[PDB]
Amino acid sequence: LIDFLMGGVSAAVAKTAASPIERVKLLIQNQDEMLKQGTLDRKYAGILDCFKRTATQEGVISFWRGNTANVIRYFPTQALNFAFKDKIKAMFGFKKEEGYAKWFAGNLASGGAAGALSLLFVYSLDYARTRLAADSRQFNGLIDVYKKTLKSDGVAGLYRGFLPSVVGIVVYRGLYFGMYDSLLASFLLGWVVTTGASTCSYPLDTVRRRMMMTSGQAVKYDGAFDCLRKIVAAEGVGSLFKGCGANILRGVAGAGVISMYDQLQ
Ligand SMILES: C=C1[C@@H]2CC[C@H]3[C@]4(C)C[C@H](O[C@@H]5O[C@H](CO)[C@@H](OS(=O)(=O)O)[C@H](OS(=O)(=O)O)[C@H]5OC(=O)CC(C)C)CC(C(=O)O)(C(=O)O)[C@H]4CC[C@]3(C2)[C@H]1O
Ligand SMILES: CCCCCCCCCO[C@@H]1O[C@H](CO)[C@@H](O)[C@H](O)[C@H]1O
């Protein structure tokens, strides 16, 4: 019971620390949708630009907007973890001695299973986190997001982009473990691997988040592939990678921060 709460706090620290660079990343990633929704007046020039305008127009507190969602995200996930993660690992898991391909495939399957299982209960918090991040306001808080989204689109409005998120989880896990196996030291390895994996899986996250953004709007995408097609055709392939640099920055920040807090505890 105590260890649970301590874990909660422990990740709350990391998420809260990484919050300012996260919102900038989310802003750059989702700016076209905000432009469609008349929430943003002009496209951002880049990271520095977004930081500047957001600071001068919203303030300093704004960089932590939506972060409470990230904080309270810990508690429902871990309850599902403790209850199902071991059992799920038991069904697919392998030692590499039993065969590398079996180990890898079982790892993808297990990560995907546990992942989808968590998201089935937790996705809406991610949705709210995103919607609150992307603003300049349209929503007032978590409860407002839930109430309004349910009012317009209902439950499905809260879970939009679920499938590319699951696909994203599997892809990311595969790249992560693959690179981690193919390869001051720990920080290096972790950073490089997480970077490669997050970058290669980044378009799925863009599709996911923008689909989230379409909630509460008359115009929506007709599937993840449809979103992909439209974004590419109108804005270019690079549009799928908007905010990726900021996301990497978020990674390098987060790793150091969580290491420091672990050292402090
Ligand atoms: C399409 C995408 C992109 C790629 C996949 C995901 C994650 C990276 C996917 C990542 O997925 C994490 O991957 C880790 C490495 O495999 C894995 O750790 S491990 O099993 O011990 O090895 C985590 O599992 S857990 O049991 O420890 O908790 C797993 O998180 C989850 O499965 C919980 C879900 C609620 C997400 C979690 C997460 C993270 O940045 O870390 C997070 O939710 O914070 C995602 C961000 C959103 C995207 C980005 C999703 O939009
Ligand atoms: C304790 C006894 C040893 C059991 C595990 C042995 C180490 C497993 C390493 O396997 C190899 O890993 C490579 C990754 O670099 C794969 O690319 C390659 O396909 C695979 O053959």
Ligand that comes closest to the CA of residue 182: 2
Taking alpha carbons only, the member of 176, 205, 203, 206 closest to residue 192 is 176
Nearest ligand 1 atom to alpha carbon 173: 16
User: At a CB cut-off of 8 Å and minimum separation 6, what does 92 contact?
Assistant: 106, 107, 109, 110, 113
* Count of other CB atoms within 10 angstroms of residue 112: 19
Q: Report how this structure was experimentally obtained.
A: X-ray
Residue with tokens 């799928």: 240
Q: Rg of the chain's alpha carbons, rounded to an integer?
A: 19
Residue 104 φ/ψ region, left for φ over 0, alpha for ψ in the -120 to 50 degree band, beta for the rest: alpha
Q: Are 199 and 166 in contact (CB under 8 A)?
A: no
Query: Strands (DSSP E) along the chain, which ranges?
Result: none
181 close to ligand 2 (CB < 6 Angstrom): yes
Q: Tell me if 73 sits within 8 A of 14, measured CB to CB.
A: no
C-alpha span between 43 and 22 (Å, rounded): 18
Cβ proximity of 219 and 36 under 8 Å: yes
| Residue of 97, 181, 182 to test ligand 2 pocket, by largest number of atoms within 8 Å of CB | 181
The reply to whether ligand 2 has any atom less than 6 angstroms from the CB of 98 is no
Query: What structural domains does the chain harbor?
Result: 1-265 (1.50.40.10)
Helices then strands, counting H and E runs in the chain, come out as 12, 0
SS (H, E, C) 177-208: HHHHHHCCHHHHHHHHHHHHHHHHCHHHHHHH
Distance (Å, rounded) from C-alpha 94 to C-alpha 215? Answer: 40
DSSP symbols for 216-239 = TSS---SSHHHHHHHHHHHH-GGG
Q: Is 160 annotated as belonging to a binding site?
A: no
The token pair at 259 is 């290491």
The b/e string for 114-138 (b: 16+ C-beta within 10 A; e otherwise) is bbbbbbeebbbbbbbbbbbbbbbeb
> Which phi and psi (to 5°) does residue 28 adopt?
-65, -35
**Which residue is it, tokens 């973890």?**
81
Which structure tokens are listed for 118?
A: 């968590």
The one-letter amino acid at 235: E
CA distance 32 to 238: 13
Q: Which residues contact 38 (CB under 8 A, 6 or more apart)?
A: none
Ligand 1 atom with minimal separation from the 167 CA: 1
Q: Which residues' Cβ are closer than 6 Å to ligand 1?
A: 77, 81, 85, 111, 114-115, 118-119, 122, 165, 168-169, 172-173, 176, 201, 204-205, 208
Cα–Cα distance list, 19 to 89, 230, 246 (Å):
31, 30, 12
Q: Is 236 left (phi over 0), alpha (psi -120 to 50) or beta?
A: left
Residue with tokens 């693959």: 178
Contacts 24+ apart (CB under 8 A), 187-196: 187/255, 187/256, 187/259, 190/255, 191/251, 191/252, 191/255, 194/251, 194/255, 195/248, 195/251
26 CA to centre of ligand 1 in angstroms: 17
Tokens found for residue 29: 């990633």
What is the spatial distance between Cα 161 and Cα 202, in angstroms, rounded to a whole number?
A: 14
Query: If DSSP codes are grouped into helix, strand and coil, which group holds residue 40?
Result: coil
114: phi then psi, degrees, rounded to nearest 5? -60, -35
Residue with the smallest CA separation from ligand 1 atom 15 is 173
Instruction: Determine the residue of 80, 172, 200, 252 to mutate for testing ligand 1's pocket, defined as the one with the most ligand atoms within 8 A of the Cβ atom.
Output: 172
Helix (H, G, I), strand (E, B) or coil at 138: coil
CA–CA dist 205, 164 (Å, integer): 7
Resolution, expressed in angstroms to one decimal: 2.5
For the Cβ of 101 lying below 6 angstroms from any atom of ligand 2, the answer is: no
Q: Which two tokens stand for residue 249?
A: 């920055």
- The beta-carbon contacts of 176-182 under 8 Å, at least 24 apart in sequence, are 177/104, 177/107, 178/104
Two tokens, residue 256 = 């150091």
